[PDB]
Design a binder for these strands. Sequence first.
DNA 1: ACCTTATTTGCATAC
DNA 2: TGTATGCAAATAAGG
Lengths: 134, 22
Amino acid sequence: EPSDLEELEQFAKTFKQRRIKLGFTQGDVGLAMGKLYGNDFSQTTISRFEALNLSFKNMCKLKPLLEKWLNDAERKKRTSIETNIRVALEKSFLENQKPTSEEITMIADQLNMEKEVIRVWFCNRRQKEKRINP
Amino acid sequence: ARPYQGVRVKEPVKELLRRKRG
DNA sequence: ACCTTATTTGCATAC
DNA sequence: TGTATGCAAATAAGG
């Protein structure tokens, strides 16, 4: 079973010191587990592991996978919306914060955008509102 | 006054440590 | 097949 | 040139 707090911060410096020992940046350790698991984790994710910037679970699900790669040797790519579609969308939000799966289709198409990414854009956005202005 | 548009990790082990110390 | 809340990741670009 | 981090996509999980 996954370790407790008193063991996680320990693995933290162990991984950092033992990492630059075999000469491998966190970014390289990322594409390293790529050719070891089916997919991978970015330089950011690995960074956050080092500085212990992750929840209990998110780090307990990683300690074992990280130690395999170090012990012995060996998800959809994020969509970045162009600022012109980020502003365009902000407007339709400003018209209606929750469009029907129909309107949503009629917007994605009306803008040449994968229907899904849009259904999601409004979701994260609505949640954003709730965080930003209550 | 930037409100911090963007999401955060709740209870990162980093802060979880500095908490159970003082 | 979609929303909601909660979270995990990770472009991008500031250090 | 490696490392953080802001802002925020993708995903997980209960309806």
